[PDB]
Amino acid sequence: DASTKKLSESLKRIGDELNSNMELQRMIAAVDTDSPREVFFRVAADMFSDGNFNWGRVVALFYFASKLVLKALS
Amino acid sequence: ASTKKLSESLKRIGDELNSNMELQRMIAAVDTDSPREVFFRVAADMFSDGNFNWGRVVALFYFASKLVLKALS
């Protein structure tokens, strides 16, 4: 009931925070199409060198990865 | 060079969501003997407002992956 509602609202906020960040969309679009994997792994590694890797960062990483995949298929 | 500012953006957004919600505690607390319909209940409410953005699709796949990993444990 309220448990699955708070969970769905939380997942809505996660998706909306990623999709509405106009700055992030510009940086992802500015990634050069010659080497997307290098950029993705360089970004994924900076997520660990901090020491505080968390679920928020893997959801952001997979958003970035999916946007990169969509970009190459387009 | 500009990869740094992109990593900073992805780190900041990721850390802001982490500090804002206890998502892992929420996912772990859902019913384990009812996997298919807890996914559809969440997926239906996520799109009840007519907003089908790609960010929500990613958020739904992460929730689905956390669901099957719990079911396989």
UniProtKB/Swiss-Prot annotation, chain A:
Motif BH3 boundaries: 7-21
Post-translational modification: Ubiquitinated in the absence of XRCC6/Ku70. Ubiquitination promotes protein degradation.
Annotated GO CC locations: BAK complex; BAX complex; Bcl-2 family protein complex; cytoplasm; cytosol; endoplasmic reticulum; endoplasmic reticulum membrane; extracellular exosome
Entry keywords, A to Z: Acetylation, Apoptosis, Cytoplasm, Host-virus interaction, Isopeptide bond, Membrane, Mitochondrion, Mitochondrion outer membrane, Nucleus, Transmembrane, Transmembrane helix, Tumor suppressor, Ubl conjugation
Annotated motif BH1, positions: 46-66
Phenotype upon changing M22 to D/E: Strongly reduced interaction with MCL1, BCL2, BCL2L1 and BCL2L2. No effect on cytochrome c release and subsequent apoptosis triggered by etoposide
Tissue specificity of this protein: Expressed in a wide variety of tissues. Isoform Psi is found in glial tumors. Isoform Alpha is expressed in spleen, breast, ovary, testis, colon and brain, and at low levels in skin and lung. Isoform Sigma is expressed in spleen, breast, ovary, testis, lung, colon, brain and at low levels in skin.
Superkingdom per UniProt: Eukaryota
Annotated signal sequence range: none
GO molecular function: BH3 domain binding; channel activity; Hsp70 protein binding; identical protein binding; lipid binding; protein heterodimerization activity; protein homodimerization activity
BP terms from Gene Ontology: apoptotic mitochondrial changes; apoptotic process; apoptotic process involved in blood vessel morphogenesis; apoptotic process involved in embryonic digit morphogenesis; apoptotic process involved in mammary gland involution; apoptotic signaling pathway; B cell apoptotic process; B cell homeostasis
Subunit-level organization: Homodimer. Forms higher oligomers under stress conditions. Forms heterooligomers with BAK. Interacts with BCL2L11. Interaction with BCL2L11 promotes BAX oligomerization and association with mitochondrial membranes, with subsequent release of cytochrome c. Forms heterodimers with BCL2, BCL2L1 isoform Bcl-X(L), BCL2L2, MCL1 and A1. Interacts with SH3GLB1. Interacts with humanin; forms fibers with humanin which results in BAX conformational changes and sequestering of BAX into the fibers, preventing BAX activation. Interacts with SFN and YWHAZ; the interaction occurs in the cytoplasm.
Domains as described in the record: Intact BH3 motif is required by BIK, BID, BAK, BAD and BAX for their pro-apoptotic activity and for their interaction with anti-apoptotic members of the Bcl-2 family.
Record-stated family: Belongs to the Bcl-2 family.
Function: Plays a role in the mitochondrial apoptotic process. Under normal conditions, BAX is largely cytosolic via constant retrotranslocation from mitochondria to the cytosol mediated by BCL2L1/Bcl-xL, which avoids accumulation of toxic BAX levels at the mitochondrial outer membrane (MOM). Under stress conditions, undergoes a conformation change that causes translocation to the mitochondrion membrane, leading to the release of cytochrome c that then triggers apoptosis. Promotes activation of CASP3, and thereby apoptosis.
UniProt-recorded name of the protein: Apoptosis regulator BAX
Organism of this sequence: Homo sapiens (Human)
Name of encoding gene: BAX
Segment of the intact protein contained: 53 to 126 of 192
